Amino acid sequence: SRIGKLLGFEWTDLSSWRRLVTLLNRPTDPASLAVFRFLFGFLMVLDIPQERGLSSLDRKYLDGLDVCRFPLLDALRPLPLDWMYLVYTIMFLGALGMMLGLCYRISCVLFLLPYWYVFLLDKTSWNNHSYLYGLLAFQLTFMDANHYWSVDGLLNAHRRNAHVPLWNYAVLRGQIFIVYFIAGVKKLDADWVEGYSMEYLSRHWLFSPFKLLLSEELTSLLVVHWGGLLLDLSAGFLLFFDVSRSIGLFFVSYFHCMNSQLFSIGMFSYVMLASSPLFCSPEWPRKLVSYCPRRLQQLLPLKAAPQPSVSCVYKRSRGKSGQKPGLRHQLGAAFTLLYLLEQLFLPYSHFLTQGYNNWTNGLYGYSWDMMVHSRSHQHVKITYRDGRTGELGYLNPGVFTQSRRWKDHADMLKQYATCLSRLLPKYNVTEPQIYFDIWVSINDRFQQRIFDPRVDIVQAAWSPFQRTSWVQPLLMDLSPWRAKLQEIKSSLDNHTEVVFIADFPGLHLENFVSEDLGNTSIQLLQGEVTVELVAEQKNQTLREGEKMQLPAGEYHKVYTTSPSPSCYMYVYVNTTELALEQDLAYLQELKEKVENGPTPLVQTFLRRQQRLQEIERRRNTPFHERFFRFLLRKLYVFRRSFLMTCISLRNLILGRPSLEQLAQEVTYANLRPFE
């Protein structure tokens, strides 16, 4: 029975449906599940005001503001602001009751339904950790997590210290393992394994110890990328097995503790840290409280033999023969199997939802592809054609949007175009044709268009299950250029910038070089292009290698005339910045020399000196002051959440008092308690 001790079960337990049900409903200690429930509820209580947007609800759902929203289904609409505050209140109460274990089933539902409603209301708020919170709440809804360390058991003794079925731990462990393993498999991407995804990250001071034995490139490639990929691929296996659990726990704890400081990912790292002990024995909190000194052993509740529970069946040789598997047991086993199968399948289901497939696969948030794809957006142009007069106009990129994710997804772009066509009549624009010229570089590739700029997105066809025709393909046979691009970028001066552009055949780039962008040049790297100067109506054909100087404050056009995609460079200098810096340096040096033996230009120098002095002082300032400031900001966020929620709840229950009273209440809500 070596396999039995290594796995927790035997091969005979999987040879029949009845034995699988019996194994998956075997009684288990609920202490570990209870501690995880308490910690998850606490972290959700902390996260509702911060990341879920309770503190900025009045800004996001203002009751008269023109805004383009991006729900998963267009039939889903946000409620008025007071009702949105009620939804967030119900979600917060559900999180409170989940953390406490009080009215656990109702509290689970009361957190789950508004949480998923808020999730589906806005596709642009989707990420992997919010999706994980939804999944964890869904799982915990069906579990007996209030059998320990809960006030439900403190007000009802039968629920106290009652055993839970084994599938409660199996589903959660499978979820955590799936997160780790699918993240690792998604990191088996050419961009990640070649160190392109997160190449700036190694220069964080938290990676200093590795630099005592590695170079910058080596710690970027081996530690951040290969190290992260190995950790993701091996964390579930290390945590599952008893022999490797201490090492796995240490590595996973280090991973999450570094991630909490490297990134702003809400409470994800703490949720994963709290999920790690789910792989330990279900009795570990009991051992932890039994290892304490005897002086603190008379106030905690006595640790006795847990009582039998009805939620799980008992199979004994002496204690009767056995009992038939009840409907609840089969339902739990089937839920375990089906849910884990769905969790395995969904990250690789993008071949069905082709309409959500851009350069990357699917909507972001449920594939566990964290930090794999980095996007740099160079420029967005939104042009409309008036359907009545034929006049061409241009919109500010993102007028009525609260997010930038529409730049990368054809579904969000279609929603944005529909919203603009609905809203622009209010701005004296008849039925508009709207075109999008969006330039993106993904993982330091050539900047290129993601959508067809000649296609009217208002009338363009989009379907969930069909690949979008107006999405430009990613120029994959140009990635090996990245080493050369990086060499060019690092081989430049400190005042010059470079933009690398790849353009499709038959298309052209209309460019207005700013007046202050003197010394602007274009150099061809691949294919052939024709550069047209609009003012002089002159076309000069470029070949591979030649560089052309371009005028500032004037228009020019780059036509890709080659049958294959062309790549060219833009090297430019902020010449006004050069003049400003040289005159500022000369003025400062002359003044210093005269003294030792106001105007905006000197105002900039004074501001820079003051900022440098403040930065130096803050570095010299003890971290207790920084901690106090951080706590004050968080307390402001929580106080504002509470006060605006109270205002809206009173509006719902009693009514709106008056404009003056509401204004005074809102002013008091933003008071910045102790600044």
Binding site: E51, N127, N128, H129, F263, S264, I265, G266, Y364, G365, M370, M371, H373, S374, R375, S376, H377, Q378, H379, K381, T383, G393, Y394, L395, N396, V399, R404, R405, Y427, W439, V499, L509, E510, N511, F512, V513, S514, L517, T520, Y555, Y570, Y572
Partner: peptide, 28 residues
């Protein structure tokens, strides 16, 4: 503003906004 002119709409060689970290979709 709501509308841009032909001039400011076509200056691709502008400094990007760089609002926080607009590179990774995982960040808040």
């Amino acid at each position: 503003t709501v509308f841009l002119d032909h001039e400011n709409a076509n200056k691709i060689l502008n400094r990007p906004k760089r609002y926080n970290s607009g590179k990774l979709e995982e960040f808040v």
